[PDB]
Write an enzyme that holds these catalytic residues in place. Sequence first.
Site, mmCIF file in Angstrom:
data_model
loop_
_atom_site.group_PDB
_atom_site.id
_atom_site.type_symbol
_atom_site.label_atom_id
_atom_site.label_comp_id
_atom_site.label_asym_id
_atom_site.label_seq_id
_atom_site.Cartn_x
_atom_site.Cartn_y
_atom_site.Cartn_z
ATOM 1 N N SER A 79 0.819 -1.223 0.000
ATOM 2 C CA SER A 79 0.000 0.000 0.000
ATOM 3 C C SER A 79 0.855 1.276 0.000
ATOM 4 O O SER A 79 2.070 1.218 -0.232
ATOM 5 C CB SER A 79 -1.024 -0.007 1.144
ATOM 6 O OG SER A 79 -2.222 -0.593 0.694
ATOM 7 N N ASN A 91 22.359 10.457 -14.886
ATOM 8 C CA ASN A 91 22.439 9.577 -13.724
ATOM 9 C C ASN A 91 21.056 8.973 -13.385
ATOM 10 O O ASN A 91 20.436 8.339 -14.241
ATOM 11 C CB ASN A 91 23.091 10.341 -12.555
ATOM 12 C CG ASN A 91 24.151 9.532 -11.847
ATOM 13 O OD1 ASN A 91 25.219 9.258 -12.416
ATOM 14 N ND2 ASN A 91 23.884 9.164 -10.593
ATOM 15 N N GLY A 93 18.425 10.478 -13.277
ATOM 16 C CA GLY A 93 17.435 11.164 -14.113
ATOM 17 C C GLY A 93 16.709 10.270 -15.106
ATOM 18 O O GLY A 93 17.337 9.580 -15.897
ATOM 19 N N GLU A 102 4.125 -4.240 -3.516
ATOM 20 C CA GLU A 102 2.791 -4.196 -4.135
ATOM 21 C C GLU A 102 2.570 -5.434 -4.967
ATOM 22 O O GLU A 102 3.523 -6.068 -5.417
ATOM 23 C CB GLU A 102 2.606 -2.969 -5.041
ATOM 24 C CG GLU A 102 2.986 -1.638 -4.421
ATOM 25 C CD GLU A 102 2.387 -1.426 -3.046
ATOM 26 O OE1 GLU A 102 1.282 -1.943 -2.774
ATOM 27 O OE2 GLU A 102 3.028 -0.720 -2.232
ATOM 28 N N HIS A 119 2.030 6.449 -16.015
ATOM 29 C CA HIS A 119 2.165 7.564 -15.095
ATOM 30 C C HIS A 119 3.620 7.883 -14.783
ATOM 31 O O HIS A 119 4.064 9.007 -14.983
ATOM 32 C CB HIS A 119 1.434 7.247 -13.784
ATOM 33 C CG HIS A 119 1.567 8.312 -12.743
ATOM 34 N ND1 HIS A 119 0.623 9.301 -12.565
ATOM 35 C CD2 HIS A 119 2.529 8.538 -11.819
ATOM 36 C CE1 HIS A 119 1.006 10.096 -11.581
ATOM 37 N NE2 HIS A 119 2.154 9.651 -11.106
ATOM 38 N N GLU A 120 4.352 6.898 -14.273
ATOM 39 C CA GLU A 120 5.753 7.104 -13.904
ATOM 40 C C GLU A 120 6.621 7.577 -15.084
ATOM 41 O O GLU A 120 7.506 8.416 -14.901
ATOM 42 C CB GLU A 120 6.370 5.833 -13.300
ATOM 43 C CG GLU A 120 5.779 5.400 -11.964
ATOM 44 C CD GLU A 120 5.750 6.513 -10.944
ATOM 45 O OE1 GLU A 120 6.727 7.290 -10.880
ATOM 46 O OE2 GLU A 120 4.739 6.624 -10.221
ATOM 47 N N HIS A 123 6.601 11.146 -15.623
ATOM 48 C CA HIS A 123 7.652 11.745 -14.793
ATOM 49 C C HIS A 123 9.026 11.660 -15.450
ATOM 50 O O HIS A 123 9.742 12.658 -15.480
ATOM 51 C CB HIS A 123 7.757 11.077 -13.418
ATOM 52 C CG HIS A 123 6.587 11.329 -12.521
ATOM 53 N ND1 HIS A 123 5.984 12.562 -12.412
ATOM 54 C CD2 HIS A 123 5.942 10.517 -11.653
ATOM 55 C CE1 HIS A 123 5.000 12.491 -11.533
ATOM 56 N NE2 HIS A 123 4.951 11.258 -11.060
ATOM 57 N N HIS A 129 2.926 16.190 -11.313
ATOM 58 C CA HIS A 129 1.533 15.881 -11.053
ATOM 59 C C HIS A 129 0.552 16.907 -11.605
ATOM 60 O O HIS A 129 0.771 18.110 -11.513
ATOM 61 C CB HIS A 129 1.332 15.638 -9.555
ATOM 62 C CG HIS A 129 1.962 14.367 -9.088
ATOM 63 N ND1 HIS A 129 2.631 14.253 -7.890
ATOM 64 C CD2 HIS A 129 2.051 13.156 -9.686
ATOM 65 C CE1 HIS A 129 3.078 13.016 -7.755
ATOM 66 N NE2 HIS A 129 2.742 12.332 -8.835
HETATM 67 C C1 LIG Z 1 1.977 8.920 0.583
HETATM 68 O O1 LIG Z 1 1.215 9.503 -0.483
HETATM 69 C C2 LIG Z 1 1.817 9.293 -1.775
HETATM 70 C C3 LIG Z 1 2.262 10.615 -2.420
HETATM 71 N N1 LIG Z 1 2.700 10.505 -3.848
HETATM 72 C C4 LIG Z 1 1.703 10.643 -4.940
HETATM 73 C C5 LIG Z 1 1.355 9.225 -5.420
HETATM 74 C C6 LIG Z 1 2.579 8.398 -5.869
HETATM 75 C C7 LIG Z 1 3.126 8.960 -7.190
HETATM 76 O O2 LIG Z 1 2.452 9.731 -7.869
HETATM 77 N N2 LIG Z 1 4.361 8.683 -7.637
HETATM 78 O O3 LIG Z 1 4.689 9.019 -8.765
HETATM 79 S S1 LIG Z 1 1.950 6.783 -6.012
HETATM 80 O O4 LIG Z 1 0.711 6.453 -4.918
HETATM 81 O O5 LIG Z 1 3.154 5.623 -5.765
HETATM 82 C C8 LIG Z 1 1.280 6.533 -7.565
HETATM 83 C C9 LIG Z 1 2.103 6.160 -8.632
HETATM 84 C C10 LIG Z 1 1.557 5.976 -9.906
HETATM 85 C C11 LIG Z 1 0.197 6.167 -10.128
HETATM 86 O O6 LIG Z 1 -0.277 5.983 -11.359
HETATM 87 C C12 LIG Z 1 -1.537 6.124 -11.796
HETATM 88 C C13 LIG Z 1 -2.097 7.401 -11.851
HETATM 89 C C14 LIG Z 1 -3.402 7.586 -12.292
HETATM 90 C C15 LIG Z 1 -4.138 6.462 -12.671
HETATM 91 O O7 LIG Z 1 -5.388 6.647 -13.071
HETATM 92 C C16 LIG Z 1 -5.889 6.714 -14.426
HETATM 93 F F1 LIG Z 1 -5.433 5.667 -15.128
HETATM 94 F F2 LIG Z 1 -7.236 6.686 -14.465
HETATM 95 F F3 LIG Z 1 -5.466 7.839 -15.014
HETATM 96 C C17 LIG Z 1 -3.598 5.176 -12.611
HETATM 97 C C18 LIG Z 1 -2.278 5.005 -12.167
HETATM 98 C C19 LIG Z 1 -0.625 6.551 -9.058
HETATM 99 C C20 LIG Z 1 -0.085 6.736 -7.779
HETATM 100 C C21 LIG Z 1 3.728 8.510 -4.841
HETATM 101 C C22 LIG Z 1 4.005 9.938 -4.314
HETATM 102 CA CA LIG Z 2 4.158 0.600 -0.986
HETATM 103 CA CA LIG Z 3 18.864 7.697 -15.995
HETATM 104 ZN ZN LIG Z 4 3.527 10.399 -9.696
#
Ligand SMILES: COCCN1CCC(C(=O)N=O)(S(=O)(=O)c2ccc(Oc3ccc(OC(F)(F)F)cc3)cc2)CC1
Ligand SMILES: [Ca+2]
Ligand SMILES: [Ca+2]
Ligand SMILES: [Zn+2]
Length: 164
Positions: A79, A91, A93, A102, A119-120, A123, A129
């Site tokens: 979780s 590096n 990056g 998970e 999503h990642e 980044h 975000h």
């Molecule tokens: C402690 O609180 C955590 C704070 N943070 C924000 C969330 C989090 C992050 O964004 N890291 O990049 S995270 O919970 O691991 C996370 C990672 C990828 C996701 O990917 C997604 C995003 C949207 C989605 O929905 C959609 F598909 F409908 F768009 C599906 C997966 C959703 C959440 C870690 C850092």
């Molecule tokens: Ca975790």
């Molecule tokens: Ca790299």
């Molecule tokens: Zn994120």
Amino acid sequence: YNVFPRTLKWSKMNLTYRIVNYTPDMTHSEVEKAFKKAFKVWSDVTPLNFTRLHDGIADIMISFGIKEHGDFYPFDGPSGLLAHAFPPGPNYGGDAHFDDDETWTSSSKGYNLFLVAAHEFGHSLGLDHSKDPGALMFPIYTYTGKSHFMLPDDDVQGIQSLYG
Ligand SMILES: COCCN1CCC(C(=O)N=O)(S(=O)(=O)c2ccc(Oc3ccc(OC(F)(F)F)cc3)cc2)CC1
Ligand SMILES: [Ca+2]
Ligand SMILES: [Ca+2]
Ligand SMILES: [Zn+2]
Ligand SMILES: [Zn+2]
């Protein structure tokens, strides 16, 4: 001589990734296909292209780890944090880390590796975000509904604002 771009972004359009190691939860094929599809989300709406490397140094190094795994963003077990990725740069990056405490799946069970990776990799390419709850870059996991994943508009605008 010459300037840095106004944002954290790649200056080259051809990027490489390497899958350093693999989650227990899915076959090698399932993971590779999830990552291939995740990069395709972004390559379909930009000039960016992605080649996989099997060894050595890729731009985007991808790994699964737990707890302390070699950076200042330790994982927290099952979780909570699912994954993290570093903005474009040298590096670390572009690298993307996935919490292997998970349960990763190709389905609606546990966390869908494709959606999180997509999503990642946002980044990894320079998107932070979004505040829009419909956006892929919204920092809350939801599992989709329609079978043909359609990158939301906010994410399309965002990535194009960096790469065309
Ligand atoms: C402690 O609180 C955590 C704070 N943070 C924000 C969330 C989090 C992050 O964004 N890291 O990049 S995270 O919970 O691991 C996370 C990672 C990828 C996701 O990917 C997604 C995003 C949207 C989605 O929905 C959609 F598909 F409908 F768009 C599906 C997966 C959703 C959440 C870690 C850092
Ligand atoms: Ca975790
Ligand atoms: Ca790299
Ligand atoms: Zn994120
Ligand atoms: Zn990490």
